[PDB]
Ligand binder design. Sequence first.
Ligand SMILES: O=c1ccn([C@@H]2O[C@H](COP(=O)(O)OP(=O)(O)O)[C@@H](O)[C@H]2O)c(=O)[nH]1
Ligand SMILES: O=C1C[C@@H](c2ccc(O)cc2)Oc2cc(O)cc(O)c21
Length: 427
Amino acid sequence: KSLKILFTALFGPGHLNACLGIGSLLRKRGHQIYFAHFPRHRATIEKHGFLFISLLDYAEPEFPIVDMLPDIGIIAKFAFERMHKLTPLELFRHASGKHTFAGMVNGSKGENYAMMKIVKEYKPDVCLADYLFNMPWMFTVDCPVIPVKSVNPIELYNGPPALTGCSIHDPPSVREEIEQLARKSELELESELEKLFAHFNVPLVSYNYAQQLGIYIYPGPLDYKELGSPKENWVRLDSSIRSTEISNFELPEKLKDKPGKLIYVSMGSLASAVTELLTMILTPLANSPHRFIVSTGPNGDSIKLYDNMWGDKFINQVALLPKVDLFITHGGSNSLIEGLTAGKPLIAIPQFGDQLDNAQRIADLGLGVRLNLHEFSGEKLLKAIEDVLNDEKINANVARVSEELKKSDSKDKVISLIEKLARDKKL
Ligand SMILES: O=c1ccn([C@@H]2O[C@H](COP(=O)(O)OP(=O)(O)O)[C@@H](O)[C@H]2O)c(=O)[nH]1
Ligand SMILES: O=C1C[C@@H](c2ccc(O)cc2)Oc2cc(O)cc(O)c21
């Protein structure tokens, strides 16, 4: 019996990519999938066979909605200046009580009204939402609503606070100060959401509450088993990667007959807007005796490439990763999971948000290194490349994690819970 299932997510290509994976799994089981998102993503959504609903067609006139992705460079460039000039402690100091994603909350009202009308009109059996924080509509719609989480899930446990990138080796003394500042900023977020929920007359809930079922995507071998069990109603899916239409990534002729290993570079869908960041990374790599393929980002046509490099604004990462020896990443979750699935070690240069946590996780479990912008130099990057390429131990740890991901059954249990909740309205 067919269910009607509606997905939505924030503007981030990463959050949408997460849900596409889930939707694919459900479409095979015979369900009708709908996706409410922005027009940039109509092509990939319909290509996967999901029905596309534009949020913009359902805006309230007084509360308009905007795809943030093309305007994101203002915000990205600020974060970059800050991250480049300050340690993560100093960053949290000079952040007053500001949470990393509070200004996002004020302007969420448009998306909220939209989702109310869309759920009313399409009368779905269940909804799923990949969002950074819960939203009033998820508690006003007739059907149940499953938050999906693709960011680092350390926030689902009682442990190091999220978004700080604390290590498991961090002594008692150095974490103490960061957790105070982070407890504080979590309270600023709670107060921002109160206004949002107040506006729609909905009892405030915790920012990452799962009423009945929550799904977080993250590799089981990287999950935080040492902190105990995740929060309630929260289930894990080890990975959620969409299938690629391309299967063979042909290498560019520019790089044929050039020495060394093949290395992929991407600072993601969002931070790659900052040309200063890419320039800072690539300039030293000109002298690295390897071949680089580079995602250059939306402003990539104004980024200089050297003889050992080839790139374009957007690359088929899932098709390419199998062919590389190393992946220099920003520590985004989807890139982390695609990278590990393909069996490749990582050098993570974290830019914002959950990336600090993922970066530290990669370092703590010996899956690569963490190299921060503040302590960044050509000499250090070039040496991290040589070190990770030649570290037998790291290369074996990554093979093991890969093997677990490629055979995981986490999907089977998750699907059941979705179907069950959709039909019974209870777990
Ligand atoms: O040239 C590129 C750059 C990025 N991506 C995709 O964009 C997503 C990036 O998500 P991630 O969580 O790694 O980073 P974020 O976008 O959250 O910064 C992943 O699915 C990548 O496969 C891609 O396909 N090609
Ligand atoms: O912290 C921020 C603010 C802003 C942002 C984007 C890019 C960047 O380089 C810096 C900040 O938007 C975001 C979007 C996210 O999905 C997750 C985030 O945490 C953030």
